[PDB]
């Protein structure tokens, strides 16, 4: 047989459904999600890290002049300073006064911490969504294997093929450009490897951590050495990667809506709760027994003994039956008012059992089916005294959940007497029209 329905996109709450093959005993089916990972497709454009400017030894040809070529180096610098007359240890360097030459070249390269901490720049594109489901049906125990969340690919769990339908929302928490620094990801724009504004993020850009081509503009400017010493000074703006580490805002795993938890190694966005997921499960024909070997109940009367508004299993109801024979048969409430904690019950000849439920209604008018037979339950509920708890709701809050019997009485008094007032005006209008017509002829 095949049972198709739609489940909500919530993780810790199982979805209970009762398949109904006529002529066979019903089978209680329970589908529970474990994970929900939205995995986009990324490509790595470039990385970035703090630089380390290295200075070669300057040449001192100090009777004459020297010139340089243009070596291929990121942010390479040349200068010639004339008439320096330096003073090393053990006297002055050379005899020629007031005409000298010092080169003092410089060159920018990446540091040795770039292997440990760096920021990876990614462009994302919408990709696969997959999830892990824990399932059971009938007497089969819990067996789990992960599926693909698209309405095409079936997955064999146990002996039943499950086709998890597409999500109703196309929402993904990643913008088109993300930065992955260490443990957390961000939503930040790139200069796209061509430009670098020397102080914000792309002062140093490298395509791979071991790559040989480097982009570097750090405004490296050479400076004249002073007072007759051999050293090479320079001035440059600080690294923007070190500045980005100070000013970075909150990461994406702290501002994500719908309670998404962001993981890293395939760049998942795990356990979001948005939309709904349709299902379609093909159940094997060997899991159905004939109805002549199962209990069948009649004369059902349902009484609710205690009900509580809270979203904990505080609702209790006992019903009275008289089955045809002893055995086990499941229970289920198909309406959206209350969920049922129990899966199956053990029966006898003319006994009574109790089940625990959970509802968000003041007056639960739900019905439940036991042993392919339905019975309507009614009662009143009281609010709880706890204000904040640390578990999610088991039920679903509707629109007319909070309206009580006294509030319905005041609405019907208001609506009923308003229309009765305005109809009496319409009745009395048509009454004097007849007696004015009857005056003439």
């Amino acid at each position: 047989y095949e049972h198709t329905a739609v489940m909500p996109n919530k993780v810790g709450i199982p979805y209970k459904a009762l398949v109904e093959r006529p002529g066979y005993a019903p089978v209680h089916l329970q589908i529970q999600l474990v994970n929900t990972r939205i995995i986009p497709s990324t490509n790595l454009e470039y990385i970035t890290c703090k630089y380390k400017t290295k200075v070669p030894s300057p040449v001192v040809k100090c009777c004459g002049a020297t010139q340089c070529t243009s070596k291929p180096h990121p942010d390479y610098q040349c200068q010639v300073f004339s008439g320096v007359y330096p003073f090393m240890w053990g006297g002055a360097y050379c005899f020629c006064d007031t005409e000298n030459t010092q080169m003092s070249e410089a060159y920018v390269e990446r540091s040795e911490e770039c292997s440990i901490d760096h920021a990876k720049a990614y462009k994302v594109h919408t990709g696969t969504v997959q999830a892990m489901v824990n399932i059971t049906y009938g007497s089969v125990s819990w067996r789990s294997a992960d599926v693909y969340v698209n309405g095409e690919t079936p997955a064999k769990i146990g002996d039943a093929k499950l086709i998890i339908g597409p999500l109703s929302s196309a929402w993904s928490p990643f913008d088109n450009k993300v930065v992955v620094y260490g443990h957390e990801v961000y939503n930040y724009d790139f200069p796209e490897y061509g430009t670098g504004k020397a102080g914000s993020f792309g002062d140093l850009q490298s395509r791979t951590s071991t790559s040989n081509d480097l982009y570097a503009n750090t405004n490296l400017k050479l400076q004249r050495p002073q007072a007759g010493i051999v050293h090479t000074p320079f001035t440059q703006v600080p690294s923007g990667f070190e500045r980005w580490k100070k000013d970075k805002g909150a990461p994406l795993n702290d501002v994500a809506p719908f309670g998404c938890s962001i993981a890293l190694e395939p760049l998942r966005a795990e356990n979001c709760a948005v939309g709904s997921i349709p299902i379609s499960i093909d159940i094997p024909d060997a899991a159905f027994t004939r109805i002549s070997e199962t209990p069948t109940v009649s004369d059902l009367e349902c009484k609710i003994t205690e009900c509580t508004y809270a979203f904990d299993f505080g609702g209790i109801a006992t019903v009275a039956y008289k089955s045809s024979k002893a055995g086990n048969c499941p229970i289920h409430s198909p309406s959206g008012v209350a969920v049922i904690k129990e899966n199956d019950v053990t029966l006898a000849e003319s006994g009574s059992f109790t089940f625990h439920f959970s509802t968000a209604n003041i007056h639960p008018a739900f019905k439940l089916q036991v042993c392919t037979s339905a019975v309507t339950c009614k009662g009143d509920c009281k609010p709880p005294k706890d204000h904040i708890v640390d578990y999610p709701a088991q039920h679903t809050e509707s629109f007319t959940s909070a309206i009580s019997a006294t509030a319905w009485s005041w609405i019907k008094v208001l609506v009923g007497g308003t229309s009765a007032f305005i109809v009496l005006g319409l009745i009395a209008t048509a009454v004097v029209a007849l007696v004015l017509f009857f005056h003439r002829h």
Binding site: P257, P384, D386, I388, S404
Partner: protein, 105 residues
């Protein structure tokens, strides 16, 4: 090894979580809501302060210090009672739906 903050004193009111924080170092406290909008707060606590956070039925998640994050959900307790005189029915639905009964009356 990084320092661990002292535990806050949590106090519960109707749709409000109150946190009494007594740190000894400048400590980061970041919260978010588990609904369709995150509405995120982020602040460094240096002196002993108290902060009140509004928790709806969707949830709230707060991280304090180097502790693991904790999630809290708000129930439907309320203040009035729905059965009774009209000065009690109106009060109960105002504490539950504060805007809908203003334009509903």
């Amino acid at each position: 090894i990084a320092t661990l903050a002292p535990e806050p004193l949590v106090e519960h009111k109707h749709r409000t979580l109150i946190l009494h924080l007594h740190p000894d170092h400048p400590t980061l406290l970041t919260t978010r809501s588990l609904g369709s909008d995150a509405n995120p707060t982020r602040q460094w606590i240096e002196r002993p302060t108290t902060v009140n956070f509004t928790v709806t039925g969707e949830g709230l998640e707060y991280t304090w210090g180097n502790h693991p994050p904790k999630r809290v959900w708000a129930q439907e307790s309320g203040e009035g009672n729905p059965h009774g005189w009209p000065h009690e029915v109106v009060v109960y639905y105002y504490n539950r739906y504060p805007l809908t009964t203003i334009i509903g009356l």
